[PDB]
Amino acid sequence: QLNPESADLRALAKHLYDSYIKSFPLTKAKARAILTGKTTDKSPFVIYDMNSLMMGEDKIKEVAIRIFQGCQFRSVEAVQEITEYAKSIPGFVNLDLNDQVTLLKYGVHEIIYTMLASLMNKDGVLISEGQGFMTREFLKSLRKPFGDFMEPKFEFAVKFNALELDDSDLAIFIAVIILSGDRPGLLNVKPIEDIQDNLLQALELQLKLNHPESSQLFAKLLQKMTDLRQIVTEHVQLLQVIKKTETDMSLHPLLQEIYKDL
Amino acid sequence: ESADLRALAKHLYDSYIKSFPLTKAKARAILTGDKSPFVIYDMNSLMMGEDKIKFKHITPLQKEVAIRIFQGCQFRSVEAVQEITEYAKSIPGFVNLDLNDQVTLLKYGVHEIIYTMLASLMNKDGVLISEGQGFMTREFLKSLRKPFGDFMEPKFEFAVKFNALELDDSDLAIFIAVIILSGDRPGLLNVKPIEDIQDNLLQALELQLKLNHPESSQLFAKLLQKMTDLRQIVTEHVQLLQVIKKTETHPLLQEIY
Numbered sequence: 001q002l003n004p005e006s007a008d009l010r011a012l013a014k015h016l017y018d019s020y021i022k023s024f025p026l027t028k029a030k031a032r033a034i035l036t037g038k039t040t041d042k043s044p045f046v047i048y049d050m051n052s053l054m055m056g057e058d059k060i061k062e063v064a065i066r067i068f069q070g071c072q073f074r075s076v077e078a079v080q081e082i083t084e085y086a087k088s089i090p091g092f093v094n095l096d097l098n099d100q101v102t103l104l105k106y107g108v109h110e111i112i113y114t115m116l117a118s119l120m121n122k123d124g125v126l127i128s129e130g131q132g133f134m135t136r137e138f139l140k141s142l143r144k145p146f147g148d149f150m151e152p153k154f155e156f157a158v159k160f161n162a163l164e165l166d167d168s169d170l171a172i173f174i175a176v177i178i179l180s181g182d183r184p185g186l187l188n189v190k191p192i193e194d195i196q197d198n199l200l201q202a203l204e205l206q207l208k209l210n211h212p213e214s215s216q217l218f219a220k221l222l223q224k225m226t227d228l229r230q231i232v233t234e235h236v237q238l239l240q241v242i243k244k245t246e247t248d249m250s251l252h253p254l255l256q257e258i259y260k261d262l
Numbered sequence: 263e264s265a266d267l268r269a270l271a272k273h274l275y276d277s278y279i280k281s282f283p284l285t286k287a288k289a290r291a292i293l294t295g296d297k298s299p300f301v302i303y304d305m306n307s308l309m310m311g312e313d314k315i316k317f318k319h320i321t322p323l324q325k326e327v328a329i330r331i332f333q334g335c336q337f338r339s340v341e342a343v344q345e346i347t348e349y350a351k352s353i354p355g356f357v358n359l360d361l362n363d364q365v366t367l368l369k370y371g372v373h374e375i376i377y378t379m380l381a382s383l384m385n386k387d388g389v390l391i392s393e394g395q396g397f398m399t400r401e402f403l404k405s406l407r408k409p410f411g412d413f414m415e416p417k418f419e420f421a422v423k424f425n426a427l428e429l430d431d432s433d434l435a436i437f438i439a440v441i442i443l444s445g446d447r448p449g450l451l452n453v454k455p456i457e458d459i460q461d462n463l464l465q466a467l468e469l470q471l472k473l474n475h476p477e478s479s480q481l482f483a484k485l486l487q488k489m490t491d492l493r494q495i496v497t498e499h500v501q502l503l504q505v506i507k508k509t510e511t512h513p514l515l516q517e518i519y
């Protein structure tokens with residue numbers, strides 16, 4: 001059975017999950033409870049058109065740009081959460097300050113789209129802490145540029161959600177992503193790889209124990225990292241376009257600094 | 263079980279040795295230590311290299327070096343494709359798949375495999391060309407004009423990082439098969455058998471790296487992560503290709519590529 005070595009890995013899995021719950025208000029378990037009608041109290045208001053969109057603010061706490069900006073500042077909130085979660089990853093705060101920054105700079109968006117999948121199903125995405133639900137079709141009819149921002153996310157979410165991962169799995173996977181090491185401009189790579197090595201090891205045991213009958217889930221989850229990269233890139237390229245077409249629209253500095261050379 | 267896996271690994275390795283002339287073991291021998299390859303470090307080196315080792319299979323197409331070099335890479339990649347295609351057919355289950363899916367897997371998998379194996383022929387200083395009879399330097403490749411100078415550079419960066427895993431032919435053989443059986447290629451008609459085979463290949467690769475590298479921790483994970491680098495190198499490559507269509511200003515030859 002489990003021995004000294006694996007015992008440490010389990011403790012690490014437990015630690016990360018505990019921190020995950022403490023850093024992210026809307027977990028996948030809650031998102032799913034809300035989406036699957038496991039309630040009467042958790043049911044969200046649905047926005048599927050301008051009609052409902054209007055009453056949206058009248059139900060939950062340029063429309064195309066309005067929505068974009070909302071989602072734009074939502075990312076900023078997420079960065080704040082992910083950053084707080086990173087600090088809890090053993091060894092992360094002990095790394096060179098500059099590396100901590102590049103790791104966050106390049107890891108944040110891949111994490112945002114990973115977790116955003118938790119709030120999606122083929123028809124839409126939860127919003128405003130789960131009080132609302134904006135349909136995929138509405139978002140796709142937005143307007144020439146903006147109508148294309150979310151489709152890639154939905155595409156990924158459908159595939160990713162197929163893995164049926166839960167919060168305890170994600171917490172470790174999210175940690176692995178932050179501690180990459182192949183990130184552009186890392187001053188010290190070895191210490192970072194040593195940590196990711198331990199996290200990868202922890203994730204592997206977690207998926208084994210948590211998904212016994214799921215053959216090679218580990219390899220399958222790791223490969224998803226390529227889909228995330230493409231999502232990030234398309235998104236960035238899309239911003240560049242909006243930046244030129246919408247000269248009056250402003251971008252949050254935190255997000256602006258992250259996009260720099262992404 | 264664990265036996266069926268070792269058998270699969272051995273099978274793939276044997277098949278790999280028969281389909282690929284220049285193996286990594288050979289390539290490494292040459293790159294390190296009796297008959298030094300002809301080195302091409304500049305214009306004159308190249309000039310002599312053409313009538314020397316006689317990799318005059320590409321050049322014969324009756325000027326400019328950057329263009330003749332790029333075109334040469336093309337002639338070689340086309341040979342690679344046939345070699346990969348042969349190898350693919352040895353992968354248990356591959357031929358029993360829908361015919362269109364087989365073509366689809368090959369169509370989208372050869373580029374990723376080409377760069378993977380290309381790493382076997384490179385080091386931080388250069389790449390082995392024409393069956394290893396040559397060695398074109400990394401600096402001479404950058405010194406090339408227009409976007410031609412930035413074509414191989416990306417591959418070199420990949421190679422340097424990829425080679426650090428110190429995989430050998432028996433490891434690469436399985437890895438390459440895993441790449442081919444990717445059930446996320448667009449247009450596939452029946453993803454199930456494909457994923458079933460890859461799952462089986464992944465299990466084979468995992469055990470292989472466990473026995474072949476008891477020393478390297480989570481090697482399996484690191485190799486899988488490289489599949490990301492490959493996709494990026496491939497998409498990035500396709501970009502220089504479109505951009506290449508602005509250096510033009512045979513019809514049957516163009517058809518071949």
Ligand SMILES: NCCc1c[nH]c2ccc(O)cc12
Nearest residue numbers: 071072074075112116125127
């Ligand atoms: N990077 C902007 C995409 C994004 C991140 N988090 C989100 C939440 C809701 C939404 O509609 C969109 C988003």
Ligand SMILES: NCCc1c[nH]c2ccc(O)cc12
Nearest residue numbers: 024025026115118127128129
């Ligand atoms: N499930 C990860 C996304 C997430 C975490 N906390 C949140 C709070 C509000 C929200 O809309 C979304 C989130």
Ligand SMILES: NCCc1c[nH]c2ccc(O)cc12
Nearest residue numbers: 317331334335338390391392
């Ligand atoms: N054999 C390494 C592939 C390659 C890159 N550039 C080349 C130029 C000529 C040639 O024969 C081959 C190549």
